[PDB]
Design an enzyme around this catalytic site. Structure first.
Site, PDB file in Angstrom:
ATOM      1  N   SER F 131       0.838  -1.186   0.000  1.00  0.00           N
ATOM      2  CA  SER F 131       0.000   0.000   0.000  1.00  0.00           C
ATOM      3  C   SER F 131       0.875   1.238   0.000  1.00  0.00           C
ATOM      4  O   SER F 131       1.852   1.310   0.744  1.00  0.00           O
ATOM      5  CB  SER F 131      -0.914   0.030   1.205  1.00  0.00           C
ATOM      6  OG  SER F 131      -0.171  -0.183   2.385  1.00  0.00           O
ATOM      7  N   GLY F 135       3.523   2.950   6.160  1.00  0.00           N
ATOM      8  CA  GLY F 135       4.928   3.210   6.379  1.00  0.00           C
ATOM      9  C   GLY F 135       5.814   2.091   5.894  1.00  0.00           C
ATOM     10  O   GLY F 135       6.875   2.338   5.322  1.00  0.00           O
ATOM     11  N   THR F 136       5.401   0.854   6.134  1.00  0.00           N
ATOM     12  CA  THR F 136       6.138  -0.287   5.623  1.00  0.00           C
ATOM     13  C   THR F 136       5.700  -0.706   4.233  1.00  0.00           C
ATOM     14  O   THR F 136       6.492  -1.310   3.509  1.00  0.00           O
ATOM     15  CB  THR F 136       6.018  -1.482   6.563  1.00  0.00           C
ATOM     16  OG1 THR F 136       6.716  -2.597   6.004  1.00  0.00           O
ATOM     17  CG2 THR F 136       4.589  -1.867   6.790  1.00  0.00           C
ATOM     18  N   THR F 170      -7.043   7.160   4.920  1.00  0.00           N
ATOM     19  CA  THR F 170      -6.815   6.908   6.333  1.00  0.00           C
ATOM     20  C   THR F 170      -6.069   8.057   6.990  1.00  0.00           C
ATOM     21  O   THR F 170      -6.521   8.601   8.002  1.00  0.00           O
ATOM     22  CB  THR F 170      -6.036   5.609   6.497  1.00  0.00           C
ATOM     23  OG1 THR F 170      -6.843   4.510   6.065  1.00  0.00           O
ATOM     24  CG2 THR F 170      -5.585   5.420   7.924  1.00  0.00           C
ATOM     25  N   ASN F 197      -9.219   1.841  -2.979  1.00  0.00           N
ATOM     26  CA  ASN F 197     -10.262   1.269  -2.143  1.00  0.00           C
ATOM     27  C   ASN F 197     -11.596   1.945  -2.344  1.00  0.00           C
ATOM     28  O   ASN F 197     -12.627   1.338  -2.047  1.00  0.00           O
ATOM     29  CB  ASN F 197      -9.867   1.344  -0.680  1.00  0.00           C
ATOM     30  CG  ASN F 197      -8.761   0.397  -0.332  1.00  0.00           C
ATOM     31  OD1 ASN F 197      -8.423  -0.491  -1.102  1.00  0.00           O
ATOM     32  ND2 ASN F 197      -8.175   0.588   0.834  1.00  0.00           N
ATOM     33  N   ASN F 219     -10.799  -7.689  -0.198  1.00  0.00           N
ATOM     34  CA  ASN F 219      -9.684  -8.595  -0.415  1.00  0.00           C
ATOM     35  C   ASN F 219     -10.077  -9.809  -1.232  1.00  0.00           C
ATOM     36  O   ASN F 219      -9.196 -10.476  -1.779  1.00  0.00           O
ATOM     37  CB  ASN F 219      -9.123  -9.068   0.910  1.00  0.00           C
ATOM     38  CG  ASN F 219      -8.589  -7.958   1.731  1.00  0.00           C
ATOM     39  OD1 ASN F 219      -8.534  -6.820   1.290  1.00  0.00           O
ATOM     40  ND2 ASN F 219      -8.183  -8.275   2.944  1.00  0.00           N
ATOM     41  N   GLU F 245       4.318 -11.755 -20.715  1.00  0.00           N
ATOM     42  CA  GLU F 245       3.511 -11.188 -21.781  1.00  0.00           C
ATOM     43  C   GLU F 245       2.908  -9.838 -21.428  1.00  0.00           C
ATOM     44  O   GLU F 245       2.340  -9.186 -22.306  1.00  0.00           O
ATOM     45  CB  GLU F 245       2.367 -12.145 -22.121  1.00  0.00           C
ATOM     46  CG  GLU F 245       2.644 -13.507 -22.798  1.00  0.00           C
ATOM     47  CD  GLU F 245       3.407 -13.521 -24.112  1.00  0.00           C
ATOM     48  OE1 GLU F 245       3.458 -14.616 -24.713  1.00  0.00           O
ATOM     49  OE2 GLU F 245       3.836 -12.477 -24.630  1.00  0.00           O
TER      50      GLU F 245
HETATM   51  N1  LIG Z   1      -7.765  -3.113  -0.035  1.00  0.00           N
HETATM   52  C1  LIG Z   1      -7.279  -3.126   1.197  1.00  0.00           C
HETATM   53  N2  LIG Z   1      -6.602  -2.032   1.671  1.00  0.00           N
HETATM   54  C2  LIG Z   1      -6.106  -2.037   2.917  1.00  0.00           C
HETATM   55  C3  LIG Z   1      -6.276  -3.130   3.719  1.00  0.00           C
HETATM   56  N3  LIG Z   1      -5.695  -2.881   4.900  1.00  0.00           N
HETATM   57  C4  LIG Z   1      -5.163  -1.648   4.863  1.00  0.00           C
HETATM   58  N4  LIG Z   1      -5.436  -1.102   3.649  1.00  0.00           N
HETATM   59  C5  LIG Z   1      -4.966   0.205   3.188  1.00  0.00           C
HETATM   60  O1  LIG Z   1      -3.815   0.458   3.942  1.00  0.00           O
HETATM   61  C6  LIG Z   1      -3.644   1.831   4.145  1.00  0.00           C
HETATM   62  C7  LIG Z   1      -2.990   2.078   5.500  1.00  0.00           C
HETATM   63  O2  LIG Z   1      -1.661   1.601   5.546  1.00  0.00           O
HETATM   64  P1  LIG Z   1      -1.388   0.084   5.942  1.00  0.00           P
HETATM   65  O3  LIG Z   1      -1.003  -0.683   4.717  1.00  0.00           O
HETATM   66  O4  LIG Z   1      -2.662  -0.464   6.527  1.00  0.00           O
HETATM   67  O5  LIG Z   1      -0.285   0.111   7.096  1.00  0.00           O
HETATM   68  P2  LIG Z   1       1.234  -0.366   6.937  1.00  0.00           P
HETATM   69  O6  LIG Z   1       1.653  -0.659   5.532  1.00  0.00           O
HETATM   70  O7  LIG Z   1       1.475  -1.542   7.832  1.00  0.00           O
HETATM   71  O8  LIG Z   1       2.074   0.875   7.495  1.00  0.00           O
HETATM   72  P3  LIG Z   1       2.421   0.956   9.054  1.00  0.00           P
HETATM   73  O9  LIG Z   1       1.221   0.581   9.872  1.00  0.00           O
HETATM   74  O10 LIG Z   1       2.870   2.345   9.392  1.00  0.00           O
HETATM   75  O11 LIG Z   1       3.526  -0.017   9.336  1.00  0.00           O
HETATM   76  C8  LIG Z   1      -5.026   2.422   4.061  1.00  0.00           C
HETATM   77  O12 LIG Z   1      -4.975   3.515   3.190  1.00  0.00           O
HETATM   78  C9  LIG Z   1      -5.883   1.369   3.426  1.00  0.00           C
HETATM   79  O13 LIG Z   1      -6.257   1.863   2.174  1.00  0.00           O
HETATM   80  C10 LIG Z   1      -6.943  -4.225   3.247  1.00  0.00           C
HETATM   81  O14 LIG Z   1      -7.093  -5.198   3.967  1.00  0.00           O
HETATM   82  N5  LIG Z   1      -7.447  -4.228   1.980  1.00  0.00           N
HETATM   83 MG   LIG Z   2       2.201  -1.526   9.758  1.00  0.00          MG
END
Ligand SMILES: Nc1nc2c(ncn2[C@@H]2O[C@H](COP(=O)(O)OP(=O)(O)OP(=O)(O)O)[C@@H](O)[C@H]2O)c(=O)[nH]1
Ligand SMILES: [Mg+2]
Ligand SMILES: Nc1nc2c(ncn2[C@@H]2O[C@H](COP(=O)(O)OP(=O)(O)OP(=O)(O)O)[C@@H](O)[C@H]2O)c(=O)[nH]1
Ligand SMILES: Nc1nc2c(ncn2[C@@H]2O[C@H](COP(=O)(O)OP(=O)(O)O)[C@@H](O)[C@H]2O)c(=O)[nH]1
Ligand SMILES: Nc1nc2c(ncn2[C@@H]2O[C@H](COP(=O)(O)OP(=O)(O)O)[C@@H](O)[C@H]2O)c(=O)[nH]1
Ligand SMILES: [Mg+2]
Lengths: 440, 426, 118, 44, 429, 430
Positions: F131, F135-136, F170, F197, F219, F245
């Site tokens: 995503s 952060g990660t 978020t 999303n 998901n 491809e």
């Molecule tokens: N489609 C979908 N998007 C998700 C889901 N969970 C989180 N997101 C997206 O994730 C974003 C928030 O960042 P995350 O990926 O949840 O958190 P992270 O990558 O672990 O970053 P940190 O918590 O700081 O370590 C939000 O904008 C959501 O759009 C999911 O289960 N499905």
């Molecule tokens: Mg995280």
């Protein structure tokens, strides 16, 4: 082939669509839940329904209709009624707040909000047809979404679809009775802006159909259910040369080329002759020439203007039942010899005949009789030039003091469109005059 | 050896052309399936004039059924003889004409003319010696008259010395089954003037005046009016198919009919039709076939020759009759009633005797007559064109396909010339 | 993209023959020939070159929306015959004063056939 | 019965009440499909 | 004695090859395991044109199947006739082509061409008097076009007198099954024009149109389009296999066909193809094969011969027929239609007659036309190629494996000069 | 042979990889304890104890997402070192996730991929799920794709990403991350299919009648797009399409590798009754802007390339006829320099319904991956909101103070300010 895409708009259009689609289900074999009783032949037995009904893989027939409204309370007894399983749910479009007898609310503000949703649905029904004859439009001039958004349906149809044939049935406003107060502002502004965009336009008004149900049928106090039943027996007779076996076939293209001579004049008037009661068909023989004379009768007409005031520009006779192609001739030759009908000077041919074998259908618990022959008619007359003169009368009345004009100016619409769409109609009143002159 | 390739156009052509293959098939002993179940050897000896051979001892017509929307050929396919046609012969489009000539001639027909002229070119070159074509069509419509003139136009430029017949159905004098009739019919006689070898005129009231007055049918459908058209489509083409004491093909009646090449509109008839109870009252001789060919009320053209002069005459006979008696009556009617015959032709009547009568009949007789009483068919369409045209009536439906205004002027004026070209001889 | 022509088989690919009842994209009936080596009109990463004459038109394609479409849309067909000269002039001026509608991707391709009565 | 095929020998069948028609000739992807008549006029 | 070695490349070549070998096995009575189960004795005489003999009366085909990954030859093995192909004749790699002509020609296909050349040299040095090689391939992919032309070049540098014969699935005009087709199509046509002796052009829109308007299949599949291609593939090599009254091999067809060395692209057609239920409306005679071989809506090529002029025409007949009827019709069409036939060649049609009709029919015929109305293919590909190439549309993928920039230039100049050569012989007096 | 190594980074990577892998166990015969009660080799690898263990690596910097996997239903299916966790998360910060915290864990994921690349014979390439907002998912993921390139070379690196939505989001600090990761992966990534999303929220509300959906309803829809991309490496087909491809037919330029995603016959089981779902009906609905998966409208830009992935009971002519109707419409308009346009792929195995799912049981399906110029608004709107906060130096002290020089804000805004002109000039005529 031979498909037709019905578009119903307004509460008037929906309640007329519920009348027609009950007739079409009974006319072919379809139940109220979509299925036929099982076809009991090898493969597909009868494919006559393809003009109106599609078919899925499983044996379910879904109509080619779109039901449009801006109030939620009219489609929500289509969605939870007897025929709630026949219609694919996405064909029935509702708004959230209605147009409220404003042309301007229904054209610029609320109609533009909802135009692109229903022009995506008519793409999908028009990409299922191998050969499309043309659309049908079912509206009434009085209401907001029946005048405003309907006039903008035709305009964006002309851009997208070109010279495809866009018929329309309409409920022209009545001369004496009337639902509403603001109906002349609606009815003038929509005949101005559908004028170069519509191909043909049949009109009836409810006061004339009141005069037949009370008098010819023996049904005192007709509700709109008894008026909508008769409208379905005109649309069925226009389209029964597309589904059932005929001796002379007529399409939906042979009406515009045979009743619309001039570009501003596309206003024919409907009539249906043997609408009779079950106590008074025990006595009357209904021949082929006995029902021809009763389309020209000013009582049995279906609009509240007399054809005798004007000149018959053309005709279109639709014969349906157990007729002979020789007794169709044996009645038309008689009608021309009377001097109480008067064809216009520059039309020495006059007519357009159509003969179909399938007799008209009996609806269980309906009004009419089980009759073995019938005649429908769409005729174009100079006697409609008295109808705009009773609409120029009631536009210039409330416009010289400018009543109700604030309900259209602040609703997204300038004010110079009022004083040109009555000037635009002012040429049409003299344009119906010069075709009323003989070529000396 | 003398093959005739049939054409039929529109909802009049595909209703005339469906009964005509039901009157030829039983004439030659062909079932609904197609097989031959005949009781002679003349029923198979000269069958190649109309029937192609197929596999397994089965015969298929040379019909090219043409339409602009296939609704009126689904009914033809579901009849009692719908399986005899090769299904590749069906030509059809998606959206029709709307009884509009230009849409049939310039716009929608012209997108369907190159698929037709693959079919006829596959059959006109599969003949050992092609004699000529046909066409059954109506001038009042949109695809009969509209592209059916484009067909004759674009095959006279590819086979320009064969025969081209047309059985027209020109419009009617009392009741008109299309408002826009005089625009279509004036614009289509003007095409047929410089593009046909022969052409027969048929009005549908003259077919009504038989089945009520003469045949005594209380309810005559168009089944029993197509059956009269197809009982003279076979009289003209019999001496090809059946032996004779005197023969006449299509060319010989064409040679002995037209004195000048602009004058090729004829008027048919058919003699031995009789009423219901009057069959036991009938005398059965030869001069009672000369009474009903020539009786001035039973032409199929609604144009009485009492107003006009018989330029030439034909006569085709079916039976085993006597050559003295056939020739005696042609001397008889010419020399009693000699105010209806032109003076610079001293024997106007061509005669022909086939030998094989229609089934159930002991004799039969067919007529074709070329008159100056047929220019009145062309006067009446002129004033209903030029009344309708001087106030520019329906013209936006026609000029909106891109037409010219002076093209209407010549098709008026070319038809005005043939009105006065015929009118020298009266 | 450019449509092309299956030379024998253009009739199955006619746009009304594939159930598309609206205005459609035209096809190239005749293909023109050329020879030699073709000049590279654009440098790397897709830039057009400086001295290559760019078109006057917009980069993004001209789709006319709903709230962008002009009020009082002109008709698709307008034959001028059986009309007065001033009324036909008003129809042609109505067509003329909307150049943005007639030039779009989803634009109105009108019809002006015929001459009005003088 | 026993009649020959002449211009006045056809009679109606008044006990027939459905005159429906079927879609034999039609189109496809782009192709003019003409398929075999299973039923007549009326669904029989 | 006149052996023919088969080469299949790409997934198109593998599926066409599987259907073609099913057709030949039906024709010669070889069951799906390899044993002869036939009726006549003509089925077993010249079986060595296609089938090597093993111990125990098994007949293994003389085919080499090439791909750049085995994802198609899993599907070839799991079919009905997958058990007759030898296991060693399958050549595959580890990584795919990826619709890339450069990875088909230089990077990945170079490590595989040595193994394929080893296999085809082993099959070619087992033939008593070999005639040549067939390649069936597609001009849109990466294994079929790139590696296929690499094989054609390395076969025709080593066996330079034998026959090279290709069946090429050239791109279709309406719908293209790859965005980056015309690069591969240009860069393969530029190689075919130097290194093949004959090349037949096949288009899928033409095959769809025949299976809809003429065979009247409601739902055709690739398992039927491959049957059409195979049925016209095994009709040009019948006179090597069966007796006749006028034999003709592939050398004789080339000799009577190609008048100039750069002009060897042909348009096929197949005569007695007829509908499902319209068998009882059509007779089966020699004029009914002629009017359907020469029908312009019967070509497998999506180019109309009425735009141009038939340089030469060949007709290969199967069945017991009459030489007067055969020669009468091949003269008759020439005299009746004389604007589509060149005049500096006075007779244009070469006719061969073989004896044994296909199993089920009474007669058959195949047509191979050489026309100057096949240049529309190359003009359309040239115009789409310059449209993408002037703007470097997809050019980084090709350039990043060591492809030059002058190679597109020389390919498009070569194809444009070939177009001008066709137009010169059309417009010659 | 023909293997695929999935890499899932972040909570939005792990929670998609709980609904992708629930499908793959069930599409084959695999139970949630590893036992089958040979097409699984693209995603599974048999141990000598009968126990199929997937080829995947789950990465997170926080233990509260993967410890649900280690306790849930699928706790015996996964190898214990295929799920990697840290102790402190990156906390919506690019700097912590790239330099200080992500560096202590980057050297252990490349240990796990090196083992999973030593068992595949023919490895097609990697897949990334992350995503942009996190952060990660944005800091560590841009550290994987830099180190994947030098260690593996020209292997294919596809990626799926949750692009930020036009209105909802978020976090506050999401436009600093969504620029700083697009700049630093723009040369190190092959193809990036993008969903957001918000547009899937407007499909589950509208196509299915699920008011108030949840991430588990989202998901599962993404898992039906990943399943139809690798659907031709497992099940038999008539026109195969590899993972090689896709880069060659949708990336005309090396700075332009952002396609979109559409999966057509998403309907409910109360509407599959009512409508036939033929090949032309589902082809026409891929190009419809109401059914896209990013809130950007392709009518306001020019198409550049397309790739249609048909799946089920389909026939080659119904594919060929339905495309030629798209090529005739005036609303699907292409760029000047793309005259061919399309790529097709036909498979045979019809889609697999999950117990508890939402979509109907269907018989044909289309997944379309189209590259459009209409994405130019999606970067220009995001460029406003980076510029809007950074013009007066907001939230910057949360980025400078952890291992990050301040000049990476001016260069990552300079660099993507060339990308907006880059999209503009490739649609311009000649
Ligand atoms: N489609 C979908 N998007 C998700 C889901 N969970 C989180 N997101 C997206 O994730 C974003 C928030 O960042 P995350 O990926 O949840 O958190 P992270 O990558 O672990 O970053 P940190 O918590 O700081 O370590 C939000 O904008 C959501 O759009 C999911 O289960 N499905
Ligand atoms: Mg995280
Ligand atoms: N003939 C006929 N007219 C009807 C019927 N129902 C309603 N009307 C007419 O409906 C008109 C009133 O406007 P409507 O059509 O009902 O309302 P609408 O189209 O929804 O427009 P708004 O209410 O303003 O939003 C009156 O002129 C009535 O004559 C009907 O069933 N038959
Ligand atoms: N004899 C005969 N005449 C017909 C028939 N149907 C229509 N007509 C005449 O043909 C004209 C109608 O044209 P039509 O053939 O229906 O139009 P088309 O289908 O466009 O060719 C009118 O003059 C009718 O009187 C028929 O079945 N038999
Ligand atoms: N006629 C036919 N064409 C095929 C078949 N399989 C694929 N194609 C064509 O092959 C082209 C794509 O090339 P492809 O087969 O992928 O080449 P490859 O990369 O070498 O496998 C498309 O034009 C398809 O139409 C088949 O079985 N028959
Ligand atoms: Mg209302």
């Amino acid at each position: 082939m031979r498909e037709c895409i019905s578009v119903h708009v307004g509460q008037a259009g929906v309640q007329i669509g519920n009348a027609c689609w009950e007739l079409y289900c009974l006319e072919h074999g379809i139940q109220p839940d979509g299925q036929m009783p099982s076809d009991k032949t090898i493969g597909g037995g009868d494919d006559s329904f393809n003009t109106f009904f599609s078919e899925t893989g499983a044996g379910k027939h879904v109509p080619r209709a779109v039901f449009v409204d801006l109030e939620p309370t009219v489609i929500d007894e289509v969605r939870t009624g007897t025929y709630r399983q026949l219609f694919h749910p996405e064909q029935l479009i509702t708004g959230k707040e209605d147009a409220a007898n404003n042309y301007a609310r229904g054209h610029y503000t609320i109609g533009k909000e909802l135009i692109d949703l229903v022009l995506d649905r008519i793409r999908k029904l028009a990409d299922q047809c191998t050969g499309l004859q043309g659309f049908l439009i079912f509206h009434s001039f009085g209401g907001g979404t029946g005048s405003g958004f309907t006039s903008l349906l035709m305009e964006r149809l002309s851009v997208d679809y070109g010279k495809k044939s866009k018929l329309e049935f309409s409920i022209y406003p009545a001369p004496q009775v009337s639902t509403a107060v603001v109906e002349p502002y609606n009815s003038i502004l929509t005949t101005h802006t559908t004028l170069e965009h519509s191909d043909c336009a049949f009109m009836v008004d409810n006061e004339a159909i009141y005069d037949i149900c009370r008098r010819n049928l023996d049904i005192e106090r007709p509700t709109y259910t008894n008026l909508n039943r008769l409208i379905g027996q005109i649309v069925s007779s226009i389209t029964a040369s597309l589904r059932f076996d005929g001796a002379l076939n007529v399409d939906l293209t042979e009406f515009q080329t045979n009743l619309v001579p001039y570009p501003r004049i596309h206003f024919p008037l409907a009539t249906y002759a043997p609408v009779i009661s079950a106590e008074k068909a025990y006595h009357e023989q209904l021949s082929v020439a006995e029902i021809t004379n009763a389309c020209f009768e000013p009582a049995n007409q279906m609009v509240k203007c007399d054809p005798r005031h004007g000149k018959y520009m053309a005709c279109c006779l639709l014969y349906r039942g157990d007729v002979v192609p020789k007794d169709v001739n044996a009645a038309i030759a008689t009608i021309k010899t009377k001097r109480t009908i008067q064809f216009v000077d520059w039309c020495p041919t006059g007519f357009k005949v159509g003969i179909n074998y399938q007799p008209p259908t009996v609806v269980p618990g309906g009004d009419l009789a089980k009759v073995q022959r019938a005649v429908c008619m769409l005729s174009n007359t100079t006697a409609i030039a008295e109808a705009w003169a009773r609409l120029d009368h009631k536009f210039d009345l409330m416009y010289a003091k400018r009543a109700f004009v604030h309900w259209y100016v602040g609703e997204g619409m300038e004010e110079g469109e009022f004083s040109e769409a009555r000037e635009d109609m002012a040429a049409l009143e003299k344009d119906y005059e010069e075709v009323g002159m003989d070529s000396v | 050896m003398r093959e005739i390739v049939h054409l039929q156009a529109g909802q009049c052509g595909n209703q005339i052309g469906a009964k005509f293959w039901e009157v030829i098939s039983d004439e030659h002993g062909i079932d609904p399936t197609g097989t031959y179940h005949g009781d002679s050897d003349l029923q198979l000896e000269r069958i190649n004039v109309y029937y192609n051979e197929a596999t397994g001892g089965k015969y298929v017509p040379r019909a090219v059924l043409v339409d602009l929307e296939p609704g009126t050929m689904d009914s033809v396919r579901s009849g009692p003889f719908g399986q005899i046609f090769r299904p590749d012969n069906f030509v059809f489009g998606q959206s029709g004409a709307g009884n509009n000539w230009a849409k049939g001639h310039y716009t929608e027909g012209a997108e369907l003319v190159d698929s037709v002229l693959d079919v006829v070119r596959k059959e006109a070159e599969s003949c050992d010696c092609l004699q000529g074509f046909q066409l059954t069509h109506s001038l009042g419509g949109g695809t009969g008259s509209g592209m059916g003139t484009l067909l004759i136009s674009k095959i006279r430029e590819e086979y320009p010395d064969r025969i081209m017949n047309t059985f027209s159905v020109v419009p009617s004098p009392k009741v008109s089954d299309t408002v826009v009739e005089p625009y279509n019919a004036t614009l289509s006689v003007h095409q047929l003037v410089e593009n046909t070898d022969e052409t027969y005129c048929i009005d549908n009231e003259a077919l009504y005046d038989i089945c009520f007055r003469t045949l005594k049918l209380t309810t005559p459908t168009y089944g029993d009016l197509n059956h009269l058209v197809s009982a003279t489509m076979s009289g003209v083409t019999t001496c090809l198919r059946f032996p004779g004491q005197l023969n006449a093909d299509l060319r010989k009646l064409a040679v002995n009919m037209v004195p000048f090449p602009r004058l090729h509109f004829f008027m048919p008839g058919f003699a031995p039709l009789t009423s219901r109870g009057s069959q036991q009252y009938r005398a059965l001789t030869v001069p009672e076939l000369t009474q009903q060919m020539f009786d001035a009320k039973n032409m199929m053209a609604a144009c009485d020759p009492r107003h006009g002069r018989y330029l030439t005459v034909a006569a085709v006979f079916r039976g085993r009759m006597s050559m003295k008696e056939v020739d005696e009556q042609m001397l008889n009617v010419q020399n009693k009633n000699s105010s209806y015959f032109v003076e610079w032709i001293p024997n106007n009547v061509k005669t022909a005797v086939c030998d094989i009568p229609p089934r159930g009949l002991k004799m039969s007789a067919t007529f074709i007559g070329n008159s100056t009483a047929i220019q009145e068919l062309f006067k009446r369409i002129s004033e209903q064109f030029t009344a309708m045209f001087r106030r520019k009536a329906f013209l936006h439906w026609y000029t909106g396909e891109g037409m010219d205004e002076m093209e209407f002027t010549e098709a008026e004026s070319n038809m005005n010339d043939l009105v006065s070209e015929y009118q020298q001889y009266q | 993209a450019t449509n092309y022509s299956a030379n024998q088989y253009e009739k199955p690919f006619s746009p009304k023959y594939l159930q598309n009842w609206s205005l459609a994209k035209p096809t190239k009936e005749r293909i023109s020939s050329h020879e030699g080596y073709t000049q590279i009109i654009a440098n790397d990463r897709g830039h057009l070159l400086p001295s290559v004459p760019r078109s006057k038109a917009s980069p993004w394609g001209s789709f006319m929306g709903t709230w962008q479409m002009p009020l009082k849309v002109p008709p698709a067909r307008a034959t001028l015959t059986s009309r007065t000269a001033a009324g036909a002039a008003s129809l042609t001026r109505w067509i003329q004063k909307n150049p943005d509608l007639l030039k779009a991707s989803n634009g109105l391709r009108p019809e002006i056939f015929g001459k009005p009565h003088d | 019965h026993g009649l020959p095929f002449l211009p006045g020998t056809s009679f109606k069948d008044l006990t027939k009440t459905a005159f429906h028609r079927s879609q034999t000739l039609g189109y496809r992807n782009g192709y003019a499909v003409v398929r075999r008549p299973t039923v007549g006029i009326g669904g029989d």
